[PDB]
């Protein structure tokens, strides 16, 4: 529904979609070879399967040939800075694939909005048209060098060259935090065994310890205990409370 979606949004208004309460098969995403670039920063591409993530956001837009390398943390560019900025500590995978089959039929649909947003904080959308604002003292017309329309659009023709050839890109934004994990991978789980030296991974915490019943009473909302040294010591069993 978001990755193999019928329609992709423009860079002008890139759609942000909530994903929750769903077990996620990352294997079909990794094994499938339709994906051109699959370079990952916060997570291993191969090990994207086992781990659990609290919240996954999927970002959708369509880019040229240059942006596949341009859309990365710490890289500077026209669209990279003026349109959609990737946080320097972004934890996730950038995913891109071919778009000749679906797009570039003349297909004039896409728009990218250049000079207007000189500075944008990360993950921010600018839906204001703002026709002028390039900079000069006069206004109310474009005039010359004084101002110009930021909202330029892509022209995709059935004759588009490989260099300007369009590509579809989907960026899944993983926010790594401690909270109830909506998405996890397709692994069934064993029951509980106590008072035994067992390698344990609870809600994806991981570690080695001895599982024992705790007399300490959580407040109902709390999920993970911790120590003076800020290491995990108390956990709430996910399936049964």
């Amino acid at each position, epitope marked *: 529904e978001v990755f193999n979606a019928t329609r992709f949004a423009s860079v002008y208004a890139w759609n942000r979609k909530r994903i929750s309460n769903c077990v996620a098969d990352y294997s079909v995403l990794y094994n499938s070879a339709s994906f051109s670039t699959f370079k990952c920063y916060g997570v291993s591409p191969t090990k994207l399967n086992d781990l659990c993530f609290t919240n996954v956001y999927a970002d959708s837009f369509v880019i040229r040939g240059d942006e596949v390398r341009q859309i990365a943390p710490g890289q500077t560019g026209k669209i990279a800075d003026y349109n959609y900025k990737l946080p320097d500590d972004f934890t996730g995978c950038v995913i891109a694939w071919n778009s000749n089959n679906l797009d570039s039929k003349g297909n004039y649909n896409y728009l990218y909005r250049l000079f207007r947003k000189s500075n944008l904080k990360p993950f921010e959308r600018d839906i204001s048209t703002e026709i002028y604002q390039a900079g000069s003292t006069p206004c109310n017309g474009v005039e010359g060098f004084n101002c110009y329309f930021p909202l*330029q*659009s892509y022209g995709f023709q059935p004759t588009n060259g490989v260099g300007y050839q369009p590509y579809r890109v989907v960026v899944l934004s993983f926010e790594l935090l401690h909270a109830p994990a909506t998405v996890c991978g397709p692994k069934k789980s064993t029951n509980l065994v106590k008072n035994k030296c067992v390698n344990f991974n609870f809600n994806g915490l991981t570690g080695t310890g001895v599982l024992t019943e705790s007399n300490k009473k959580f407040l109902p909302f709390q999920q993970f205990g911790r120590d003076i040294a800020d290491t995990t010591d108390a956990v709430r069993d996910p399936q049964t409370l």
Partner: antibody, heavy 117, light 106 residues
Framework: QVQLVQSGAEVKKPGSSVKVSCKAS????????ISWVRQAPGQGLEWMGRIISMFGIANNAQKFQGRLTITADTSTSTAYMELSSLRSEDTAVYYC????????????????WGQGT | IVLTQSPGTLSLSPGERATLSCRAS???????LAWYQQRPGQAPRLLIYGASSRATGIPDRFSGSGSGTDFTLTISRLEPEDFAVYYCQQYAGSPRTFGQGTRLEI
């Protein structure tokens, strides 16, 4: 190829409101800055409005500011104009204008006009 | 701004080199003018845009020049079917203003 249909000639009573159409047939619509112009009989042409089709937002010429509401219906690929406070002298021929609003491609103003009302 | 043309009408026999210049009261730009040719009782048609960037679909015979506050449109070889009305049209910013028109008579 591209054309805007001519209407039947109009005469209007003072104080009413007149709606004038502008059809677009053929070519690649929704990428043009369709606008609105007019010329009184025996006087030069004067501009009234400018429409960017994608965001459907329009601006009105100073001299006509506060009297014209202009909208563009992308679904039917048409451009509409609404004029209020009609007077006796306002009966005249009314034109329609367009042209791509794209910069760094030169352009900004082009022709692609029709015939009139 | 008012775009003052030169002159209101130039009475030229066919074949004459007609410079229908147009002068601006303040600077506008060198890729900032456009000229439209209105056929009798019809709607004007673009021939030259951005002062000198020739519009596609138009013969080379028509050629605009100038920059700043003084702009020039030249018609090199008048033919009998070219009698028509020509309008200059400021292209930079502000409300669009169209020239007063030149009528070519016999």
């Amino acid at each position: 190829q591209v054309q805007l249909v001519q209407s039947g000639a109009e005469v209007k009573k003072p104080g009413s409101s007149v709606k004038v159409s502008c059809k677009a047939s053929g070519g690649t619509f929704s990428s043009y800055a369709i606008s609105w112009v007019r010329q009184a009989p025996g006087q030069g042409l004067e501009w009234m409005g400018r429409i960017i089709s994608m965001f459907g937002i329009a601006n009105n010429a100073q001299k006509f500011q506060g009297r014209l509401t202009i909208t563009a219906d992308t679904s039917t690929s048409t451009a509409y104009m609404e004029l209020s406070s009609l007077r006796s002298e306002d009966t005249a021929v009314y034109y329609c204008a367009r042209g791509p609003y794209y910069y760094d491609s030169g352009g900004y103003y082009l022709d692609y006009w029709g015939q009139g009302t | 701004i008012v775009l003052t043309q030169s002159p209101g009408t130039l009475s030229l026999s066919p074949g004459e080199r007609a410079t229908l210049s147009c002068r601006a009261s303040q600077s506008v730009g060198s890729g900032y003018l456009a000229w439209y040719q209105q056929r009798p009782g019809q709607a004007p048609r673009l021939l030259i845009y951005g002062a000198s960037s020739r519009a596609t679909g138009i013969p080379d015979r028509f050629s605009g020049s100038g920059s700043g506050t003084d702009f020039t449109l030249t018609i090199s070889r008048l033919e009998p079917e070219d009698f028509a009305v020509y309008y200059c049209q400021q292209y930079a910013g502000s409300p669009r203003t169209f020239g007063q028109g030149t009528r070519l008579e016999i």
